[PDB]
Amino acid sequence: KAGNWLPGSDAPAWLPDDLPGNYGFDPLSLGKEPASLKRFTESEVIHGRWAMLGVAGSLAVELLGYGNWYDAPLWAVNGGKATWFGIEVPFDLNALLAFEFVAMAAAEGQRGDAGGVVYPGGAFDPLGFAKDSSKSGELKLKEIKNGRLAMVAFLGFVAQHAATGKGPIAALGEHLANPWGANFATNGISVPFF
Amino acid sequence: RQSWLPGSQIPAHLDTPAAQALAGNFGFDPLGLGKDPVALRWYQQAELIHCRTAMAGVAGILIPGLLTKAGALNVPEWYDAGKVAIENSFAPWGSLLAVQLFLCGFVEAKRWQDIRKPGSQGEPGSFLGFEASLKGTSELGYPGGPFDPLGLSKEADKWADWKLKEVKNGRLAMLAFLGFVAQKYATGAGPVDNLAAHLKDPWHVNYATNGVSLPFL
Amino acid sequence: MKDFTTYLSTAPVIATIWFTFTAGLLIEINRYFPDPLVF
Amino acid sequence: DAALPSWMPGADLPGYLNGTLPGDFGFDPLYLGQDPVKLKWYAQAELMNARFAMLAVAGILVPELLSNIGFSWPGAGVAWYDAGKFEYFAPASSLFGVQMLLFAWVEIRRYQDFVKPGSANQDPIFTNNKLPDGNEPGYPGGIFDPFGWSKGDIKSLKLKEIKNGRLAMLAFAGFIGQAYTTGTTPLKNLSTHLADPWSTTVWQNDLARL
Amino acid sequence: DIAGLTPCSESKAYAKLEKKELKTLEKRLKQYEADSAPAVALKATMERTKARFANYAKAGLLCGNDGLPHLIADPGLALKYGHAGEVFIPTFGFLYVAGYIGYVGRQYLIAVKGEAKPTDKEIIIDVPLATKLAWQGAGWPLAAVQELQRGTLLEKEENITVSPR
Ligand code: CLA
Ligand code: CLA
Ligand SMILES: CC1=C[C@H](O)CC(C)(C)[C@H]1/C=C/C(C)=C/C=C/C(C)=C/C=C/C=C(C)/C=C/C=C(C)/C=C/C1=C(C)C[C@H](O)CC1(C)C
Ligand SMILES: CC1=C[C@H](O)CC(C)(C)[C@H]1/C=C/C(C)=C/C=C/C(C)=C/C=C/C=C(C)/C=C/C=C(C)/C=C/C1=C(C)C[C@H](O)CC1(C)C
Ligand SMILES: CC(=O)/C=C/C=C(C)/C=C/[C@H]1[C@H](C)CCCC1(C)C
To answer: What top-level branch of life does the organism fall under (chain C)?
Structure first.
């Protein structure tokens, strides 16, 4: 296990030690059954990968001056054209949903028909970064930890946006300009008595 | 043996070992609605649901009303909060009630199925892996898993006392809401305002002075 | 007194007392609430 | 039911108070400490409330006492209850959030050590730093006692701590009562009572406002 | 409004009927003195008439072409146009009292049925048991529904006498 989430507390007896990112954090005992634990493990890994891609995309698009992550589908609310890296795109919302739905359905169907494979490798690992199983477990710990941080970061993005209105990069600069005056307590909705 | 009436004949159905296992057993059943063990179990579930619902409602009425009296909040009266909240809203009351009925019907149907068969909600391959956590404890109406995240029900020594603080308080809340309705049809003001008006002059402002609760006087 | 109470517990005496009580209650209700046609 | 000092000489005190707890005088007419688990929780609650009220009474009395003398500083004429609407370097909301997070961390650490003694005596960052193995809930020791004052007569010192805590709790309740009735700072009420104690009493003050 | 009827508060025949009743009462009152018992009785009757007409018009009743009120028996129309107090609420009130009396009588019969001489308990009413059951019958719908769900409300076919067909 990677450690203990709560010092002094004993880890649950149903969490295997060889599991990547095992911190013994399960106060609700949701992964009590091994069948549910396997599905939740694959779901957590997939969630972390998608969260990493989403956080990286939001930060990149906001740091490149192409608007925040919230103003991304705004071109299809009032009528416009999407621009990727400043290059015009001739696809409308009606055609984008069709191609994305077809491609995602085919890829997800192929992935789910394997019986819940979490670490496929092979075609998805052309560089061979996991050729030996001795170091494969160490990188899995980094992967699940980065995914957990990415999920928390995306939750923070959505929460800070709904609480203030500014984007993640715009909120960071505002907090760095006025730390005591710009935080979660000065937004006005986190603490109603203040 | 604690009783709701010292000297009164406690019913035989309320003296069974199973009936005494329930929290807040004071031998109160003048109509004999708990003679049938199945009926007693169903009514025990109903009392628990009513206690929790009444506690949440009375809390949502009393706390914002007490904060409104001070400068903490500006929440309107409980009998007028519906209109004010639906005025500057995003949907009419009909659409909101429809979504509410759907979402409440799903969970109440699951709770009903678990009442009919305890632990039946843990059927494998039925809730995307979350069915295991949907099985409650040995006592009906006291589930674990997603509910009770702090895990305060694992210590048995306080468990028997914890339930006593849940039913009794709930019973009080059930009467509280009743008062909230009666006072609404007797004084025309809110509960906090009625409390303040009574504290101003208790010897002349009560239910025997409004002329509604005592028409013969 | 046991025989007197048993006689008062017969069907005609009980019927008389019960109907007198019910009739009196209905009469007093209509007296303090004259002409009730609706709720 | 022993030879320990009591709050009523000759009275039949309850048997669950055997003197193990500090400041045991057998005072419980409502029998709130009948349950051993409830009493175990109430001891920690009393100790925490006692130390907090001690810090409160000290922080209420010291600034007002220093303001009445030649000592001067920015917030001197402001009352203890009027310190909330003061111009600081940061808004009260930000400070409230910061203290809530810090108090959450330390209170969770204390709770963890309370449900299991010795389970939180290790510094999470530096493994070498730690607290002594012999420890009880509510009495941390170690770095919390850098001068080793607890190595002496711990029983008398614990009795002093609980007695001072009870006195401070009563004093803070009195501060609240005096602020709600008189509407003036506590030291002002103390000086008012010291000028003429026969006519400056709670009965006289409350009868005048009736 | 409903079925071509008009509210009693806006019906001319309703007001004419009230004026007719008050006119005949006043005409009968003119033959007596002012501080006599028949005059006070007639004035009380007139006040009762005024209060009755005012209360009927205040209740929102629907009057016809004859000036008399009409009742709405359809549950939809009653709950949609504010007429539930005519025939809906009294219907449920009678259902509660009817099932109340029926359940009290049924409980008394079943209780005295297992005794040595039930006929004596039928001609000579056992006042303590009857009073206890009368006070306990307030939960009659709950007890009846619980009895129906348990299957103990009805008797089996084999235990009931029938004709030789
Ligand atoms: C005892 C026999 C009985 C009879 C003969 C009627 C007869 C009638 N009912 Mg009805 N009803 C009854 C019992 C009865 N009801 C009971 C026991 C209930 C309680 C569940 C209802 C509750 C009820 C409602 C809620 C409504 C009616 C309505 C109606 C009227 C037209 C609808 C219809 O015929 O379909 C039979 C009625 C039903 C199957 C109940 C459901 C309502 C249907 C779906 C009609 C709703 C569509 C729409 C509103 C019709 C109006 C068209 C136009 C005038 C705008 C009609 C005169 C409707 C009406 O005229 O509103 C004032 C109305 O909305 N009833
Ligand atoms: C325990 C009393 C009792 C109960 C529960 C019933 C129940 C029933 N009767 Mg019945 N009945 C009773 C007494 C009772 N009856 C008496 C005393 C008589 C002689 C007058 C009748 C004569 C009778 C006939 C002719 C018919 C019924 C029918 C029916 C059925 C239809 C519902 C109905 O209301 O019909 C009507 C009810 C009556 C006409 C009489 C009601 C008399 C009172 C209200 C009942 C209680 C009186 C009793 C003195 C109180 C108990 C005292 C005790 C507490 C000390 C129903 C199951 C019908 C049927 O055949 O089934 C489908 C039917 O045709 N009954
Ligand atoms: C473990 C446990 C157990 C115990 O016992 C109990 C409890 C406590 C319950 C627990 C916990 C839990 C949790 C924490 C959870 C969470 C989760 C999450 C957050 C997720 C997310 C997750 C998240 C995610 C996926 C996300 C994703 C995202 C994305 C893709 C994005 C995208 C995008 C971008 C790029 C940008 C643009 O402009 C827009 C868009 C297009 C939109
Ligand atoms: C036991 C017995 C048996 C024997 O045998 C006989 C006898 C005697 C009869 C008996 C008795 C009985 C009783 C008393 C009962 C009662 C109950 C109740 C009261 C309930 C309530 C209950 C109640 C409840 C739930 C309540 C709930 C509430 C709520 C949700 C609220 C809500 C709200 C809010 C928040 C606010 C807003 O603004 C408004 C609203 C929307 C309004
Ligand atoms: C919205 C809708 O219509 C349903 C979508 C359901 C899916 C993709 C579930 C797919 C699988 C799962 C997890 C169970 C085994 C077989 C599948 C195809 C991998």
So the answer is: Eukaryota
What's the CATH number where D198 sits?
A: 1.10.3460.10
In a domain, B20, yes or no: yes
d(CA E78, CA A47): 56
Residue to substitute from A33, A37, A43, A47, interface B, most B β-carbons within 10 A: A33
- What backbone phi and psi angles, to 5 degrees, belong to B141? 90, 5
CATH value at residue B191: 1.10.3460.10
Specify if D74 maps to a domain.
Answer: yes
Number of domains in chain D: 1
- Which residues of chain B lie closer than 8 angstroms to D35, CB-CB? 161
Q: Which residues, other chains included, contact D46 with Cβ-Cβ below 8 Å and sequence gap of 6+?
A: D162, D165
Q: Which contacts of D16-22 are long-range, i.e. CB under 8 A and separated by 24 or more positions?
A: D22/D155, D22/D158, D22/D159, D22/D161, D22/D162
Which structure tokens are listed for B132? 């295991």
Q: Please, which residues bridge with residue A87 across strands?
A: A84
Atom of ligand 5 nearest to the CA of A113: 19
Decide if B149 is inside a domain: yes
Contact E5, E70 (CB under 8 A): yes
Q: How was this structure determined?
A: cryo-EM
Asked whether residue D24 is domain-assigned, the answer is: no
Q: Are strands E69-70 and E6-7 parallel, antiparallel or unpaired?
A: unpaired
Residue pair A151/A51 in contact (Cβ under 8 Å)? The answer is yes
A180 shares contact with chain D (CB less than 8 Å): yes
Please indicate, yes or no, if residue D54 is contained in any of the structural domains: yes
* Resolution, Å (one decimal): 3.2
- Residue D108 C-beta-side C-alpha neighbours within 13 Å: 11
CA distances from D142 to D50, D152, D154 (A): 21, 14, 14
